[model samples]
Every structure is written in C-alpha cells, then in structure tokens.
Target chain A: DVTALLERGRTLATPVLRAAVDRLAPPMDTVAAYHFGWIDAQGNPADGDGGKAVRPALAVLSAEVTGAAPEVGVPGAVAVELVHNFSLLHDDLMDGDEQRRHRDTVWKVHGPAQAILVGDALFALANEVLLELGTVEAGRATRRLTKASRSLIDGQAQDISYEHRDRVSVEECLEMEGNKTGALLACASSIGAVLGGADERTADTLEKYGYHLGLAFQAVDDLLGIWGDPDATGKQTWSDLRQRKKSLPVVAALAAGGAASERLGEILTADAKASDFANFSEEEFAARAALIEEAGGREWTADEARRQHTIAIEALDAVDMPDRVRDRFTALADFVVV
Target chain B: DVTALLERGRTLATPVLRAAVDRLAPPMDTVAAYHFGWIDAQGNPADGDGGKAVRPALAVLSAEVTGAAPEVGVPGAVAVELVHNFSLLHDDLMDGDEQRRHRDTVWKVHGPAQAILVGDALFALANEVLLELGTVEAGRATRRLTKASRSLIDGQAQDISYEHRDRVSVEECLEMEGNKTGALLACASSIGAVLGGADERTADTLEKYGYHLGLAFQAVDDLLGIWGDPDATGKQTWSDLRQRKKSLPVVAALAAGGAASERLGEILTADAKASDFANFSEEEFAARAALIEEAGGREWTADEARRQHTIAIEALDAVDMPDRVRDRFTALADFVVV
Candidate 1:
C-alpha cells in the first residue's frame, strides 16, 4: 500500500521536477536526466528508474492529512525530490561512487565538474520552485529547505571527517546520520503540512515523525547493507565491510569492545593498507560480516531500527488527523523497519 | 571613487554573511570561513582578502539609484556575494586550481570533499538569507538569483565541455563566458533595482549594464591571464597559455588563418601530448605569445574590451537616475578596464 502511494507520488511529481530541470541549459538537462536514470550516458532515453520517491509521498500524505488537496502539495513534493536528487548527485562525487541505481553515476559518466554544477543548479531550482509558489508560505517553505540542506552538508562534512578517524562514538555517528538523512525527511514531512496551513504544533509533530522515520530507515539500511541479498538491495553483498566504511552497525560493534570487535578492527586496519579493493576477497568480506554479527552488531542495529520505528509511529499519534490518513501514516512508519 | 563604494558594500555585507554561515554546523562553518579567506587552513584568523566586492557594489548602488537607502540593498548584496563565492569554491575544485587570492584554495588545503560541502552550505545559506528578508521582494530576489545561478552552472558546464575539444568557435566561447560570468552580475545589478521598487524598464537596463560590464571584465581578465605581470595579476605569467586554455585571444588567433596561427597550432598540438607542462619552456611560451599578437589577437581582444566598456557606460544613461548616481555607475564600469 505504501509502495502504491509512493508510486502515485512519483508519477505526480516527476513532470514538475523534470520540467524545472529541462529549463536548465543544454548538457545540464541531459546530465541531470541521466542522473535521475531517465537517460543513458549518451543522452539516449533509458529505463529511467528513479528511486522509491518516499519523500514526495510523505509530503503529499502530510498535506492530505492536514485537509488540503494532494495537488496543493505538488510544489512541496517536487521541492523535496529535487533536493533529494541534488544530494545524490553530489554524494556520488564526494564518495567517488562510480555506480548507483544499476547504472553509472552522473560524476562517473559526465565528469565530476559537470556533476557538481548540475547539483548546484538543482539546488537553485529547488528554491526557485518554492519561491514561485508566490506566498508567505512559500517563503517559509524556502527557509525550511535551506535549513535542511545546511544540515545535510554538515552531516556529510562530519561523515568525511569520521572516515579519517579509527574510532567514533555511537552518539556522534547517530547525530551525523540524523543530520544527513533525518533533516530532509523532517522537512519533507512538515513542508506539506505548513503549506496546508496546519498549526505549528501539528507541522512540528509531523517533522518529528519524519525525523525518527529517517533514523529508522537509515538503521535498517545499515543492516541491509551488510546482510541483504545483492539482487534485493541492488548492491554488492557486504559492501560496507569491503569498503571498510564507518557505518552505524560497524561503529556500534566496535564500541561493544569484545573479541569479535577486536577481530573486526584488526581486519579493517589491515584492509586500510589495501585500499585498492582488489586485495580484498569475497571470503574475507563474508568473514568480517560474520565477526560483526558475533559482536552483537546485527542485534543492536535491528533493535535500534525497531526503537526508532516505534518512536516514529508514536510521533504520528500526536497529530490529530482522520482515521484513514492516520492509517497511511502508520503504514509509512511500519514500512521502514519491515 | 568606485572602490569607496565597493569597500562600503563589503563592510555592510560581511557581517550578515558571517552570521548566516555561523549558523551552519561545525567544520562546515570553519571550512567556509577558511574558504572566504577569513581564516587559514588550520582555522586561525587570517587577513581574509575576499576579492573586490564588485557584484555587491552594483547591488547597493542600484538600490540607491532607485531611491532606496543603500543599506536597503545589503541583503541583495550579501545574496549575490554568497552565490559568487559558492561558484568560486566549486570552480576551484573543478579547474584543479591550487591557489586563489594569493593563497591556497579550499580544496588544496581542506580537501575537495570538504570544499564541495562548504560550497553547498554557502549556497543554502545564500537562499536562507534571501528568504529571511521576509517580504515579497525576497521571493523576487530569490527568482533572480536562481535563474542567474542556473545560467552560471550551464555556462560552467559548457566551458568544461569545450576543454575536451581541440577547437571552439569565438562566438560559442563568448556565449560561454557570458553565461559563466555575466549572468550573476546581471542578477546582482537588477535585484537591488527590483527591491528598491524600480520599474521593470529601469531594472532591465541595469541588468544590461552588468551584462556588458561582465564581458569587459572577462575580456580584460583574459588578457591578464596571458601577459599580465605576475605581481599585479596575482597569477603566473602566461598561465592560460601554459594550461592550453581556449581563452579569447587563443581562439581569435586560431581563427586568424596565418603563419603565426599555424605555428601556434603546431605548438599546441605538440604540447597536447605533454599535459604536465614539463616539456614547455620559457622561450616557447614567449614565441607563442608573440604569434598570438602577430595574428592581431591582442589588439582585437583589447578593442573588444573597450567596446564592451563603452556599451556598459551607455547602458547607465538609459536609467533615469541622478547624475551623481550615474557617475558612480560610470566609475564602476570604467574601473573594469583600468
């Protein structure tokens, strides 16, 4: 049911977002289209499988819960989606990820310089779309997006800083992750409510709903990153281990301070010298994943996901909407940990 | 005289920008401050020589011309300056430039990832500052800045694309230059006019003034990049030629179709294989510069710069501002070539 709503949101918001990018000068339109999976490296149209569009769905649903028509939330939906893709574009470059969504990333295909500029343009366009709404609410919407974007950048900066360190506290990791993923989701959830003339308390409650929902989503994603099937997750198995990334479960396991944690730490330290990845083996990756599980990382992360999911659902209860709208909101929260 | 106004604009705008950026999270604020030249790489306070506040000066002057207090335009000035520095941060990374403002670039000192994130934070801060203006004029200013940012990105994309090619037409080069530099300047000039309640025609003329001023500035910058004294220009002599850049004079010489053009082409072709600059010599560089001048490129570029300067001055006459304000505008235009 949530996927159905998400698809509806994607269908409704794609054209508005696409048209905003299409207005950008040539090559940028093509580069942005490619990044969104709408085209191949050569600018030819392709399958165009953009991700799940969950953020836009939240925006539209929040608006509906506030007694506004879903269409009235289109600007908010598009704005969040644009901001989401903008982050995707820059993250690919910053992380040097060559592939995403079963295709080469924008930076990998078009070049990092172009990707950076396209990302900048999308950011400008996101604000442009909000301002074009031409209301005091639109100004408020712009402010919300700007704050979220600033937090996201800060999170990314912290994430990079952590990469150079051998150890990080779980608290700092959670704070960074919240800033990275939770800030935008919070904005997406509340923006629709704000645009719908919801009271400050209601909108803020929705923001909390999305914030914990984001934490839940990221925690589950950390688990899936190490454990999910390659076909299912559209990623390599044990990718986090292979890359020696400082993701949540790994950090949590390291903080646990047991034999398994010691072994994982040794493996990661040894792997650091072999940065080329060719020296790392599938067997070695699998072994490290097992060690993480041995250290209670899997259990801790799964429990954390559940804890955040519960909080996310409880946040929805604070919002006084109709039963039908409340059901969808509950479903959205439950979908994360599932 | 224009420098006095430029200094005034800087004084009014810097604190507002510093406050906006201070709102960002740790490391990002530090990195942005360092990039703004407010601090050294180690986060120590430095001389912080931000470039001449040309765009901000235009904003404050335009507002004054349109019968508003110059301080009324500080928000607009800050908005443009933020966008300008955002471009600078990203551009430095894209161009692989190691130095700026007589110091190491942010990417060179803080690393590319941090530089990129800081650039993004500043961009978000720019829009945040505008939205905080809390008026309908804020929305209009946001639109103006957004469109200009898009064009700037598009121009950057085009300039990057041109680098991979052996040939680029002069017309196309000029268009790219216009897009890269002129768009934001035009927006900076027009935004204050709009904020100060100028009529559409007046705002449009001021935009034209900035457009021509940008062209003239860029044309002169091109000349300096090739032959300017390193002490005066704060760049290596023959830097553009050494990098094999397709600058205006190079493109003009390439289009001239003479013995000097043929000789210059051969040198570039030979130098293409040696991208490291190790194979180049001072004598060779001198010969190439001589060839470019012999092909009449130097004269043509200098003439073009003056032509643009003249047109920019004429544009100020179209605005019905008082002679004193017009004199400031004229002085600003004249300062570009001088």
Candidate 2:
C-alpha cells in the first residue's frame, strides 16, 4: 500500500513536472531532461533512476489527510519535488559529488556553472508553480516552501563551513541537519495541506511530524554513507570517509572521545595536512570506518533514527485524520528510515 | 530631479534591504554584509560602495507613474534589488569576475560555494518579502519576478556556452542579452506598477519600455567591457577581452567576415587551444579590442544602443503618464547609456 501511494503520487505529479520542464528553453531543457533521467548522458532516451518520489508522496498524503482529492495537491507535489531536485543539482556541485542516481551528476556531465544555473531555475519554478494556482492558500504554501528553501540553503552553507573546523558539536550538527534535511520535508508534509485549505494548526502539526521524520531519514542516510552497499547507495564504498564529510556518524563518534575517536581524529588531521584532497587509501578508509563503529557511532546513529521515528509518529497524534491515512503515513515513514 | 528621485528610492529601500539581510544566518550574513561593503574583508565595519542604486530607482519611479507614493513600492524596490544583487553574486562566480562595486565580489571574498548559497538565500528572500505583503498584487509581482529570474539563469547559461564557441551570430547574442539583461529590468520597470494597483496593460507597456532599455544598458556595458577604465568598472583593463567572452561586439564583428575580424579569431583560437585559461598578455588583449573596433563592432553596438533607446522611449507612448515621470525615465535611460 505504501508503494502504491508512492506510485500514485508520482503518477499525479510527473505529468505536471514534465510539462513545467518542457517549457524550459534550449540547452537548459536538454540538461534538465538528462537530469531527470528521461535522457542519458548523450541526450538519448533512457529510463534511469531520477529519485524515489518520496517528497511528492508526502505532499499527496498530506493533502488526502484534509479529505481532498490527490489532484488538489499535484502542484504542491511538483513544487517540492522541483525544490528537492534543485538542491540535488546544487548540492552535488557544492559537495564536489560526481554521481547521483547511479549516473553522473549534472555538474559532472555539464559543468558547475550549468548545474547552478539549472538549480536556480528550478528554485524559481517552485515558487512560480504554486503562485500560478492563484489562491490565498497557494500564496501561503509558496511562503512556507520558500522559507524551507532558505533554510535548506542555510543548512548547505553550514555544512560547507563546518568542513574546515576540527570539531563540530553534536548540537551544531543536529541544527544543520534539521535545516538541511528536515526543513524541506517539513514543507512538503504541510505544503499540500496549506494548499488544500487545512487549518493552520493542523498544517503546523504535520510539519512537526515531517521535520522529525527527516532527522530519522538523514540518520539512516548517514549510516548508509558509511556502511551500506555501494551499489545500493550509488557511491563508492566508505564514501563519506573518503570525502571527509563530517556526517552524523563521524560527528557522534568523535564526540564519544575514546581512544578510537582520538586516533580517528589524528588520522583525519594527517589527511587534511596532505591538503590536496588525495583521498585516504582504501585501508585507511576501512580502518577509519571500523573505528567509528568501535567508538559506538554506528549504534548511536542507528538508535537516533528509531528515536526520531518515534517522535515523528507521535507528532501525528495531535492532528486528527482517517485511520487508513494515518496508517499509510506511518508505513511510509517506516519505509524511509530503512 | 532624476538624481533626487534616485536618492529618495535608495533611502526608502535601503532600510528594508538591510532588515531582510539581517535575518540571514552566520557566515552568510557576514559574507553578505562584506559583499555589500558594509564591512571590510576582516569583518570590521567599513563604509563602501554597495551599488549605484539604479534598479531600485526604476522600481520607485515605476510606482510613481501609477500615481502612488514611492513608499508603496519599497517592497518591490527591495525585491528587484535583491534579485539584481543575487545575479551579481552568482554571475561573478560563473564569470570568474573578481571585483564589483570597486570591492572584491562575494565569490572572490568568500568562496564560490558561499557566494551561491547567499545568492540563493537572497532570491528566496526576494519572493518572501513580496508574499509577506499579503496582497494579490504582491502575488502577481512574485510570479513576474520569478519568471524573470529563470530567464536570467537561461541567459547566463547561453553566455557561458557562447564563450566556448568559435563564432556566435549577432542575433543569438541579442537574444541572450535580452534574456540575461532585459528580463530583470523589465520586471523592475513594471513590478512597482503591478504592486501599485495599475492595470496589466499599463504594466505591460512599461515592461516593453524596460526591455528595450536593458538592451541599451547592456550595449553600454559591452562597450565598457572592452574600453572602460579599470577604476570605474572595478575590473582589469579590457576585461571582456581577457575572459574571451563572445560579447555582442565580438559576435557582430566576427560575423562581419573582414580582415580585422579574421585576424582576431585566429589569435583567440590559439589561446583556446592552449587548453588553459592563462589570460592573454596585455598587448594581445589590446590588439583584440582594436581589431573588434576596426571590424566595426564598436560603432554598430553604440548605434544599436541609441536605436533601442529610441524604441524604448516610444513604447512608453502606449500608456498615458505624467510628463515629469516620462522626462525622468528618459533622463535615467540617458544616464545609463553613457
């Protein structure tokens, strides 16, 4: 049923998404098509992974909780998905990430400049799509979406700045994650409600639910970054360690302050001294990854995911919805934290 | 009177601009303040040139033409200026431009990544500032602004692409400039009218006027790109030539198929073949600038600006307005073309 929900959301949102992207001028249209996996690197048609359509499903489910038809939420669904894709385009460039969805990122295939330009264009379209609905609800939804976008940008800024520091507090890291990962989810969860004329109190409660859900989502992502199968996650093994990203697992383990943590820091410091960003050797990455687990980072992060998932489900209690819809929400949340 | 109008617009809009920026998170706020030259690079407070306040002036004047006090359009003024400044940040990064407003650009002062993040935040703020006004007029204005922002991105994409090409036609150059330069100006010229309760016809007429004005504005900029004083433009001498930008002047001259143009292309081809962006020596840049001029690029561009100015002024005739406002618009256009 959860998979069915995602498929339905995708079906409803994709047509509008395709239409909006179709309106893009020249080389941008080509690149965007490639980005969405409608085309391969050479601009030939190919069915590739674009994304899981997670955000759009949230948008539709949030609308359905208001007893509206899913179509009522299609614009909001498309807008948040566009916003998410925009972040992916820019984030890939800023992180110097070369791949996504098992394919080369836009920046890797085109250039950073094109990536940023296309990313910015999508951000603009997110607002335009909502506002074109020409209702007060649409305007309110646009405000929430844009607010989330700014937080996303802020989160990205903090992530970049935190890279240079030797220490990042757990509190600081959580705040960054909340902004980076949680804010957009919050918007997606509530935006459809906002667009479908839900009461503000209800919309705000759903936002809280989605915000916590996002933390759990990110905790799992960080776990996968370190330990998941490379093919499943579409990155090299020990990808975060290789990139020297201060992801949650690393941040939590470093705060544990054991001998493993201390040694881990020392190794990382030596790598930084190299300064050329020549990645640590495979053995070094494996050792570093192994040490973080020994310092209990992996377990703590795995627990945090469950803890936040609990909070997210509980947040939904404050708002009334159909029993079927509520179960669907929990099921989808369960699916993502894995 | 035009000077007084420009000053008044700056006075009214600067407060809201500062308030909007003051809400930015750390490092971004710092970089933005530094970019605006409100502080020195070291974070100490310092007086500096932010910009000439030209776009805000247009917003206010556009509002006045709709029989509203300039105060009514302050939000519009701030939004357009925010959008304009957003472009400057990203444009500087993409073009590898090091200086703006006689100060190091945000990308130059900070990193390209920060420049992008802050620019993105400002763009979100632009829409936020408008929608927060809670008016239908504000909603319409946001749609216009976002549409313009997308065009701006597309234009920038075209410019970057043109740089790698050996030849670009004059028509293609004009279209790119129209999207890059004209779209924002068109939005700014009419957004205040939209905000001030003018009919779409009047607002559209103003948009037509502004689009042509922007073509003229970019023409003057292209001229300055090659021949302007470094101190005045805050760039190295023959800056566009050094970047090997296929600007309008070069595009027109290349299409002319004359001896001077042939030699200019040959010299530039060698530089590109070097496979590194080692800027041409001063003598080479000067020679290219001279060749473009000798090929009649300079004269054609200068003539085109005046021709566009004539058309822009005439387009204003489609809508009735106060004589004083008309004269003021003409004066501002005159000032920009120089």
Candidate 3:
C-alpha cells in the first residue's frame, strides 16, 4: 500500500509528462521513445517498459515527509525524472557505454548522434515542464531544481575528465558524487520543502539529508561495481574492473599508499587488455577482491558511507520534523547504507 | 493589405513558435536570438526582424488550401521552421561561418558546442510540439520527419566526405545539393500536407514541388556562393572561391575538360590557403568566369533550375488548387531563383 502511494503519485504525473515528452520531435523524439523502450528499431511499439520511477518516488516521499499534499509536488515530479533520464542518456552516449539494465544502451542501439539528440531533447522537456509551473512558489522551486541540473552536468564533466588520469583520491570521488548523485537528491527534498512552504532552515537540513543519503548510495554502488553478482545487480560483475573505472573503492585504494595500493595501481595501470581485472576469471576476481580488502580501501569507502549516512540522519534531526516524517527518511538512509 | 494578411498569419502562429524558441534556452539562445535579430547577447529584446516566415506561411497556406482554419497547422508550422533553424545552427558550427544576416552567427558568438546544442534543442522541441497533437499523428509525423532529418545528416556526411576529393562530377554535386536541400523542403511541404489532411497523391505532389523548388534554390545559392556581394548578401564576395568549395559552377567547370578545366583542377588540387583568394585579381576571376560561361555550364545549370522550377510548378498545378492561391508559391520561387 505504501508502494501504492508511489504509484499513484507517478500516475498523477503522467499526463504532464506526456505533454513534456510530446515536445521532443522526430529522430530525437523517436530515439528517446526507443531508448525508453516505447518503440523498436522499426519504430513500432515494443514490449519493454522504461526504467523504474525512482526519482518520482523520491519526490513523493519528500512531499509525504514534509506534510505537503503530494498533489502539490506531482506537477514537478516528471521534471525530476526527465532530468535524471537526460543525464543518463548523455552519460551513456559520451562515455560509450554500450549497455544498461541488461539491454543495448541508446547510443549503441540508435548511434551516438541520435542518442545525443535524445538527451538534449529530454533536457529541454525538463525545463519546459519546470517553466509551466508559473507561480512564484513553483518558480522558486524550479530555480533550485535547475541549479541541480547544472550541477549534475558539472559532476558528469568532472567524472569524464577524471577517467583520463590517475591518482584521484577518495575525497575527489566523494566530491564528484556530491555533485552527481547528491545534488539531485538534495533538489528532490528541497523542492518538496518548497512545495510545502517549509522554512529555509528546515529545507536546508532536508537537503543535507539527501546529500548524505545519495553519497552513501553511490558508495554502495561503487562497492557493487567490483563485487556484486550480475544476477542481482543487472550489471557485468567485473565491469568496473574491466573498464578500470575510478570508483570509490579504487580511488581510496590508490590514495592509501601501501603495498596493497601499489599492487592495485599496477593492476589498474597495466595495459587493460593484459590485466587480471581486464580479462579476469571468477577465480582471479575473488583473489583480487582480497587484495582490495587488504588495501583498507573497502573499509575506507564503507566508513565514508557510514559517516555520510550519520550526517544525513543528523540533518533530519536538525529539521525539527515530526517523528513519522523523519522516520521514513531514516528508513531510506538505512536502506542505502545497508 | 497583402502585407497585413501575411503579418496576421505570422501572428497566429506565434504562440507555438514562441514556445519553440523559449524552449531553445540560453547562451546559444542569446546567439540564436541574435542571429534571428530578436535579442542581444544579454537577453534583451531587439527591434530587427527574423527570416521571412516561409515555412509557417506554407503551414497556414496548407490549412487554407485544405479548408481548415489556418491556425490548425500551427504546431507543424513551428516544427518546420524550428527544424530549418536547427540545421542552420549546426551548419554554421561545421562551416565555421561567422555571420548571418547582419549579426554574428550562432557558433561564432556562442562557440560550436553551445550552437550545436541550440540546434539540437530546436529539433527536440519540434518533435515535442508534433507529439502534442496526438500519438498516432505525432508518431507518423515523427517517422516522416526522422527520414528527412536522416537525409540531412547523410547530406552533411557526404559534404564532409567529399571536401577532400577532387573527382566530384556535375551529377554528384547536383545529388549532394538535392540531399542537402531537397529533403528538408520536401519534408516541410509534406508536413503541411499531413497537417492539412491532404491525400497521399496531393502530399506526394507537394513533396515533388518542394524537391524541385529546393534544388532550384540550391543552384541559385551555388551561383551566389561564387558571385554574391558581401554587403547585400552578408557573405564575402569571393567566399566560396576563397575556400575552393566544389560549388555547381566550379564542378561544372571541372567537368568541361578543357584548358580551363585543367587549370581549375590544378587549383583545386593545390593546398590553397585563405590568402590565395587575395592573390587572384578581378581579371583572373573574369577569366575563370569566361571559362565557366564558355563551357555552357553556367547557362546549363540555369536551364536545369528552369526545368526544375517548371516541374515544381506543374506539380503544384496537379494538386487542384486555386490559381491565385498558387501564385504565392510562384512568388517564393521567383524570390529564390533571382
């Protein structure tokens, strides 16, 4: 039934979203719909569904926790989702990511040219939806949301730049995640607070809660990138390793400066074609996992997650929110940190 | 009275058109607005006008001819114009053209990346507007437009690929111009037909009209590219000649296979610099012009355009429209062909 609240909220957002998505024209519009799994290569309707309504769920939850009518935030929900999808579309295209959610990614399927246009279309639609709410209150919330959009772009730019170099620290990775994951979540909470007409201090604390919760989520994701099962994660089990992606654990390992760190760097720096991780066996990954653990990087990243989660919970406490309201966020934090 | 009627049609289409421009968003918005002479870089509105609303005129005229209210094709009108602007944005970026009308070009003022995005946003917005009509209709229009968009890309790819080669025939150059110009113009007219509920035969003939009209326009453009005035046309008088672009006259000269063709081929094969245009005196240009005229290529191209224009006019006549109603199309042709 609680999940039903999420569904209803999403349902409320659909028409507005359709209007927004309707604005993206052919080639781009078709590619976007195809990428979202609305159509096939022949541009006919396909059976697959689009991604989970995660960002909309967050927006609804934020409204629920803030004592605002979820209806007040519903108009803005699709805007949030569009921004997330836009980021993913561009990220996949620019990074040459070939697959996602066990499917051929948009760029891989439609070609980079079409995929890039789709991303650009989604971004414009997001803005169009935001601007549609013309009230001062809605406008203020939208302004904050727009800042998050820009921040996510900056984070992605940094993420891409970081890949071409070595020696990135855990702190640097955290900074990137803050702008990437953290800022978007912060906007989710802040927008809800704005919808509710919450005080500035309360909104700020809620933003802090989102920031930390997002960092913890990304930390877990990075950990999974190295060790998670493909069945469970819907990603290649050793994809990060094969790609030598500078994830949180890897960044920390490089920063630790010990024998384990040296070994880790050597593995990462070797010709990707010739490295253990690049073409690693299951047996090899298990052994390499032990080396990563020994470098103290695993514990370091997890500890960082815990520290951020603690800050998030503290932020909730500072908000002077009702117990039931704060508890939901705490539960979300627990889900992320677990 | 006629000008007022045209202005009324322009005003009727402004809402959707303004929405498209609004969704185009900033920085490049500033540059685009500047290029359109709508605003300065600081986002302040300006007094100068934009390009003649030809595509929108097509949309309204389509509606009038179909016996529907003129505003019925508003979205399609906006879409075609938006698509045209999108191509200009990208073409300016690729060609490194620095000025248009009387202002700095979008890419020159805003940089290639921003200009690219501006064009991209227009494309997205165009599709989004089409989708606003209804899914089936939008989907059909998008499919049609996507084909046109792809042709544009294909044309661009061909133009880029052929830039380094010297073996382009008169046939290849004409084909390139067809892809580059005919596809979009045909698409615009077809879109209007689709909006106005024209039957397939009527739509096809309109497409034929647009195809020949577009080719005729391109032949004229190629002539202008070699000989247009800097002050009146806002292009360098020797612009295409300086770049040694393989325009129709140039390619025709190359195909003539005489002493002039040999000299032109040697020039085309040389590593010509921008300064080389300065090296060629007016007398040299006169000599080259005489060779082009002597080859019968210039007159032949003009004859080709004349035949195309006649074909287009015939196609328009086949559509069973009013005589005076078709006069506007003739006027547009006259404007371009001159």
TM-scores of all candidate predictions against the true structure: 0.88, 0.88, 0.56
Tens-place lDDT digits, model 1, residues B1-338? 76798898888888988887877777787888887778887888998576778888888887888788988888888889888888999998999889886789999998888878888887887787777766777767777788788778878888777776776778988998888888888888888877877766787888898988899988998898899988787767798887788888988888888898888777777777766667777777878888999988888889989999888889888789978888888888888885
True contacts kept of 3: 0.01
- CAPRI classification of candidate 2: medium
Q: Score the docking of each candidate (DockQ).
A: 0.56, 0.54, 0.04
**Which ten contiguous residues of candidate 3 chain B have the minimum total lDDT?**
B134-143
The best-first sequence of candidates by DockQ reads 1, 2, 3
lDDT per residue (tens digit) for residues A133-155 in model 1: 76777777777788788788878
Residue-level lDDT of model 2, residues A121-233, one tens digit each, is 88888888998887888888888898889889889888888877887878898989999899989998888888889877999999999999999999999999989886688
Interface RMSD of each: 1.6, 1.4, 10.8
Give candidate 3's error at residue A41 in angstroms. 2.3
